Amino acid sequence: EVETFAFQAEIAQLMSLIINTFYSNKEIFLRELISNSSDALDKIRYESLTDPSKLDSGKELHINLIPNKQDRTLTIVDTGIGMTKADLINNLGTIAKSGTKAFMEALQAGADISMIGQFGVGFYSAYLVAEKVTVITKHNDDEQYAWESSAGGSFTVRTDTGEPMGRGTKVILHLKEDQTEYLEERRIKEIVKKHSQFIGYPITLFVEKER
Ligand SMILES: CCc1c(O)cc(O)c(C(=O)c2ccc(OCCN3CCOCC3)c(OC)c2)c1CC(=O)N(CCOC)CCOC
């Protein structure tokens, strides 16, 4: 019931670089995940133009940011197009991406890690701040799946039994011990304002009552 997959070698190499390189500007992970959510929302909106029943799984197009200081998790959920199981396996770890090698070669030539999203691999910037990432996703054409990886060269995929999501993708960042600033309301607001000011979907930052 839990399938384990190896990352393609260049993706494993990229994840190691992101994990081991000294780089203080870690807040760009949030811009990259919000960007991915925006792209997925653009896609379901586009498909709904010619087939409105594709919104039968939910008409609201939005992005929610949910910090949990108890679990030490930051969750990003969107109601975009979501991913099939094949989407997860093909595009979240087993296949090359010409952008993966291009990015590592650009880094070799002096580029900055913050350029990662130009190479189509911005998701992996999550590993700047997370020791483990869980991705829960639901596409209209498939069931709900959970992808998960703590790097180390492998990821798992399983059918997900948790709260049904309707449609979309939820990224759960299990934060590293020294990266808990990204659970603070003021810090998240600062990052969204700086980097995601023009995203064309409502971004709601959930709050927590103190301890
Ligand atoms: C976990 C990262 C993430 C996220 O944080 C929030 C999200 O909502 C989703 C999505 O569900 C999503 C679904 C479809 C998308 O676009 C389909 C068409 N395009 C055409 C060009 O070529 C690619 C597909 C898409 O665009 C960003 C995102 C994802 C997944 C994701 O970003 N992926 C890109 C690769 O990451 C390394 C995986 C996409 O597999 C389909």
Curated annotation (Swiss-Prot):
One of its GO terms (biological process) is regulation of protein-containing complex assembly. Changing residue 32 to A: Strong ATP-binding. Strong interaction with HSF1, HIF1A, ERBB2, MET, KEAP1 and RHOBTB2. No effect on interaction with TSC1. Keywords: Acetylation, ATP-binding, Cell membrane, Chaperone, Cytoplasm, Host-virus interaction, Hydrolase, Membrane, Mitochondrion, Nucleotide-binding, Nucleus, Phosphoprotein, S-nitrosylation, Stress response, Ubl conjugation. The modification N6-acetyllysine is found at residues 43, 69. GO terms for molecular function: ATP binding; ATP hydrolysis activity; ATP-dependent protein folding chaperone; CTP binding; dATP binding; disordered domain specific binding; DNA polymerase binding; enzyme-substrate adaptor activity. Residues 1-211 are annotated as: Interaction with NR3C1. ISGylated. ATP binds at residues 36, 78, 97, 123. GO terms for cellular component: apical plasma membrane; axonal growth cone; basolateral plasma membrane; brush border membrane; cell surface; cytoplasm; cytosol; dendritic growth cone. The keyword ATP-binding applies. It is found in: Nucleus; Cytoplasm; Melanosome; Cell membrane. Changing residue 78 to A: Impaired ATP-binding. Strong interaction with HIF1A, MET, KEAP1 and RHOBTB2. Loss of interaction with HSF1 and ERBB2. Los of interaction with TSC1. Belongs to the heat shock protein 90 family. The TPR repeat-binding motif mediates interaction with TPR repeat-containing proteins like the co-chaperone STUB1. Molecular chaperone that promotes the maturation, structural maintenance and proper regulation of specific target proteins involved for instance in cell cycle control and signal transduction. Undergoes a functional cycle that is linked to its ATPase activity which is essential for its chaperone activity. This cycle probably induces conformational changes in the client proteins, thereby causing their activation. Interacts dynamically with various co-chaperones that modulate its substrate recognition, ATPase cycle and chaperone function. Homodimer. Identified in NR3C1/GCR steroid receptor-chaperone complexes formed at least by NR3C1, HSP90AA1 and a variety of proteins containing TPR repeats such as FKBP4, FKBP5, PPID, PPP5C or STIP1. Forms a complex containing HSP90AA1, TSC1 and TSC2; TSC1 is required to recruit TCS2 to the complex. The closed form interacts (via the middle domain and TPR repeat-binding motif) with co-chaperone TSC1 (via C-terminus). Interacts with TOM34. Interacts with TERT; the interaction, together with PTGES3, is required for correct assembly and stabilization of the TERT holoenzyme complex. (Microbial infection) Interacts with herpes simplex virus 1 protein US11; this interaction inhibits TBK1-induced interferon production. This is Heat shock protein HSP 90-alpha. It comes from Homo sapiens (Human). The lineage of its organism: Eukaryota, Metazoa, Chordata, Craniata, Vertebrata. The chain holds residues 16 to 226 of 732 of the full protein.
